[PDB]
Amino acid sequence: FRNKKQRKQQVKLRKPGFAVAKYVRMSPRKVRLVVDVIRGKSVQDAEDLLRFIPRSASEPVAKVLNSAKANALHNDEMLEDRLFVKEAYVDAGPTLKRLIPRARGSANIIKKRTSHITIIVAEKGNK
Amino acid sequence: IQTGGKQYRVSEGDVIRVESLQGEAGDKVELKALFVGGEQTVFGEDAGKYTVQAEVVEHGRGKKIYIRKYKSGVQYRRRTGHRQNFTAIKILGI
Amino acid sequence: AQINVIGQNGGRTIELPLPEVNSGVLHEVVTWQLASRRRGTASTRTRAQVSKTGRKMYGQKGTGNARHGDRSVPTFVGGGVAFGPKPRSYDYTLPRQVRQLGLAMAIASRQEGGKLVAVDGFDIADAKTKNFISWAKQNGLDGTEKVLLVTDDENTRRAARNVSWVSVLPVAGVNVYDILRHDRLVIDAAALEIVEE
Amino acid sequence: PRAKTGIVRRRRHKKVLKRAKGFWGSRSKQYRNAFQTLLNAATYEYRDRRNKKRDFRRLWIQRINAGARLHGMNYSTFINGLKRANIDLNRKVLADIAAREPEAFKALVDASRNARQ
Amino acid sequence: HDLKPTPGSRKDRKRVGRGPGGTDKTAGRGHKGQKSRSGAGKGAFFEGGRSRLIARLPKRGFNNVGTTYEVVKLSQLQDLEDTTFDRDTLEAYRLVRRKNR
RNA sequence: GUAGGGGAGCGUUCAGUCCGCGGAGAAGCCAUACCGGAAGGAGUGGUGGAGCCGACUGAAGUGCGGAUGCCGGCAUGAGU
RNA sequence: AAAGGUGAAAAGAACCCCGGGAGGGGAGUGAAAGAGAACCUGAAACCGUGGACUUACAAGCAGUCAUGGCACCUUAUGCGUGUUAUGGCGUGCCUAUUGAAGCAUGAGCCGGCGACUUAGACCUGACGUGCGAGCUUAAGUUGAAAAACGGAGGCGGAGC
Numbered sequence A: 001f002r003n004k005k006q007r008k009q010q011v012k013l014r015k016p017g018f019a020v021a022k023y024v025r026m027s028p029r030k031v032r033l034v035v036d037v038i039r040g041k042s043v044q045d046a047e048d049l050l051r052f053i054p055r056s057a058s059e060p061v062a063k064v065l066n067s068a069k070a071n072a073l074h075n076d077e078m079l080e081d082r083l084f085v086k087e088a089y090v091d092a093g094p095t096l097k098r099l100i101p102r103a104r105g106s107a108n109i110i111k112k113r114t115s116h117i118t119i120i121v122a123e124k125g126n127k
Numbered sequence B: 001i002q003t004g005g006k007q008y009r010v011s012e013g014d015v016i017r018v019e020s021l022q023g024e025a026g027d028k029v030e031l032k033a034l035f036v037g038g039e040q041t042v043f044g045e046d047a048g049k050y051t052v053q054a055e056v057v058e059h060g061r062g063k064k065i066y067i068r069k070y071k072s073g074v075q076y077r078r079r080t081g082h083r084q085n086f087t088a089i090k091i092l093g094i
Numbered sequence C: 001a002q003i004n005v006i007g008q009n010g011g012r013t014i015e016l017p018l019p020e021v022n023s024g025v026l027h028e029v030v031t032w033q034l035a036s037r038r039r040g041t042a043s044t045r046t047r048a049q050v051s052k053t054g055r056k057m058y059g060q061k062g063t064g065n066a067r068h069g070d071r072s073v074p075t076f077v078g079g080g081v082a083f084g085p086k087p088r089s090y091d092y093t094l095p096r097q098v099r100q101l102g103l104a105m106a107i108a109s110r111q112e113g114g115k116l117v118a119v120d121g122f123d124i125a126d127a128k129t130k131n132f133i134s135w136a137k138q139n140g141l142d143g144t145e146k147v148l149l150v151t152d153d154e155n156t157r158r159a160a161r162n163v164s165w166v167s168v169l170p171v172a173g174v175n176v177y178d179i180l181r182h183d184r185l186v187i188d189a190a191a192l193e194i195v196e197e
Numbered sequence D: 001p002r003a004k005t006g007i008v009r010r011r012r013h014k015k016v017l018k019r020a021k022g023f024w025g026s027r028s029k030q031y032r033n034a035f036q037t038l039l040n041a042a043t044y045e046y047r048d049r050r051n052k053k054r055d056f057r058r059l060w061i062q063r064i065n066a067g068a069r070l071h072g073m074n075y076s077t078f079i080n081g082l083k084r085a086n087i088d089l090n091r092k093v094l095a096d097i098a099a100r101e102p103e104a105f106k107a108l109v110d111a112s113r114n115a116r117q
Numbered sequence E: 001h002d003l004k005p006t007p008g009s010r011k012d013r014k015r016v017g018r019g020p021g022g023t024d025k026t027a028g029r030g031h032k033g034q035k036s037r038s039g040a041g042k043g044a045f046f047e048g049g050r051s052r053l054i055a056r057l058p059k060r061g062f063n064n065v066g067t068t069y070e071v072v073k074l075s076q077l078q079d080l081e082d083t084t085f086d087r088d089t090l091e092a093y094r095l096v097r098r099k100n101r
Numbered sequence F: 001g002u003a004g005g006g007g008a009g010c011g012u013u014c015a016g017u018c019c020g021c022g023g024a025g026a027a028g029c030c031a032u033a034c035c036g037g038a039a040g041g042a043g044u045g046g047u048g049g050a051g052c053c054g055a056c057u058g059a060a061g062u063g064c065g066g067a068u069g070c071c072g073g074c075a076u077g078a079g080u
Numbered sequence G: 001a002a003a004g005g006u007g008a009a010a011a012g013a014a015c016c017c018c019g020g021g022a023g024g025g026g027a028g029u030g031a032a033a034g035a036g037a038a039c040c041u042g043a044a045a046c047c048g049u050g051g052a053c054u055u056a057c058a059a060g061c062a063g064u065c066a067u068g069g070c071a072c073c074u075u076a077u078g079c080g081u082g083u084u085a086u087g088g089c090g091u092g093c094c095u096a097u098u099g100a101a102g103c104a105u106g107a108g109c110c111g112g113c114g115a116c117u118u119a120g121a122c123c124u125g126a127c128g129u130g131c132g133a134g135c136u137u138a139a140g141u142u143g144a145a146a147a148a149c150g151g152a153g154g155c156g157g158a159g160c
Ligand SMILES: [Mg+2]
Pocket: C051, C078, C079
């Protein structure tokens, strides 16, 4: 094993079949709805469903899935016909705050929330 | 029990209140108030005819409890620690 | 009640503070020395006044949840300091008699192990430092102990710099803190040491 | 000098927060409510310490006239006999006998009936 | 090297009764100091007055500041101190000194 | 046992003195069933990546749940 | 007003993949990229994903004590630790009050900020030390990686 210092140079820390769309200008809540259908499904169903879910979050999500697919293949040399959505989740990016005017002189703050859409693909393996 | 037990037991190492007789051995005798050690169902003073011997095993302190006291709107809060002193005794007796 | 090193072998004089020294009185003295040396330069805009901020706000009533007059108060971030430190002294005149009994009692404690009176450093020659090392080595001054050299002679002084070793003190300007601070006292100049009144 | 809070508060806060283990909602998550919950728990802790001492005697008393009645007696009556037969000072663990050893419990019922009549 | 205590600057102990700690207003929760209404807050109210006995009592007076003499007892000169001479300069050196009186 | 009076101490920063520790891993953070009569304090592991415990004495901008308290971040109402 | 921080050195990431891009994954640099330019640590509120135990006849200041069920053994197998079912008990906190769960006040939550101080040759008391029928110096002067000098004056000493 040695000590931490050595471990850091010996083992270099990998992200197999992981992709992330950081700072996506959409609300987590809203984006989650789409991701929620795609989770657990086989990367091909995931691909096909996304093309028909009539939500604008579909485009962002679908893109992450293709990055996760490409990464799984090209970088990690995984088997395409075995890929499935092992994990997908939407985490909250930083909020774009904006000042909206209301009646009688008072102001308000619009929260233009952002998303961190991460999807991780893996090979199935029943056996 | 209320210190100084009784009853037909099968020679177990039970924990009771402090016994003064430090370290191992020490040896303690108990009056006995009921028994079935030989199917004979005898109780009270007729049980005193018999006496159980037990050897002192370990002197100890109990698990740490915390005395917490509280009274509302009278600003009263009290936190104090407590640990109960004991003696472990291995029963042998007649 | 002690002997000399080079240039003679007298000593014997001085009535030392009874019984076997009171740390209490030495403590009274050390605290005072340290208090006097302290320069109270307390950086603080204590006053809701001293800090840079306007004078009125958001009306007494109405606003709907508030009650404030200024942005300068201590309850405000950026505002003044309720009771912060302002500049001051801590210096006081410790009774004369107690200062006398002070270093007398301090010397007394070194006169129970690590004391030393010297008459001239013929051993030195120039400044050299290398030669003070020599001189001190012969007198059991290896460097294991912190030594306080109190000499009225300018050239033995120039041979005092060095590590967990020597601190040089001039024209009998002796200090109760300075002697208690070091392991040994090289009382040297027998001017303050022996003959008084 | 300036003596800032840094560390003192957080340590004290995390302490209270850790007493709140399986407390519902905010009670295990926000300090103010966690600490607040514990004051009420304090009342409960001191009380229940001497309250359990009433609880068990009652459970024991219950198992007693359950057996005493099984042999045509009752608690009031059965304990009076065992008092009259001075020799019997059992009192504590007289319920274990009633629960685990019926044969042995009968012996005590029989002995109580005598010292009484 | 072993762990050593050693006397000196690190061994200059307090003096048992020398200096106690000040009052810091929090001895449990149940310290919300001063009183509990009216004689709490700012700095004033007073501790003297101008009717609370004083006014209601008499005199016009007349204060003087005449001649005040420094006392020299018989007992000072007699018993001890054999005629060390009084004079005008040797009277001070004994211990019965003031000037201006 | 409320106001209040009296006593003994825990903790923080700074200082002086002593004893040490640290890139073969400092502080800080995180987890923990151990210890102490309390404030509290250790052991171990994890994270961090360069400073720092312990003891004695000195000094304070020294301990927060409240003040329609101040600053900041983030919730609810609501996918309305 | 608010705003600080890569790395020892820019060696500031050529090249490949998904994408219009953003963003990411690799390759390489580096001790570390568990430092990548939204660059030291990175608490808490708050948002998720995964796992354990659980929950659709239940009346709930949300705990507490007792017991049973499941689960886990890194201050940890006599014990515990986490969770759960049922039973008993149980009127948030602060403030203000004769009287607060009160349908009286305050507070969305967390973090940090935030309230008995300082001055004075002032008065009076406790404690401690130094001298002691005596006790002290002030301004200042001289030294100062340091203290000495300075009795002008102040207090006790007699009262009416
Ligand atoms: Mg400022």
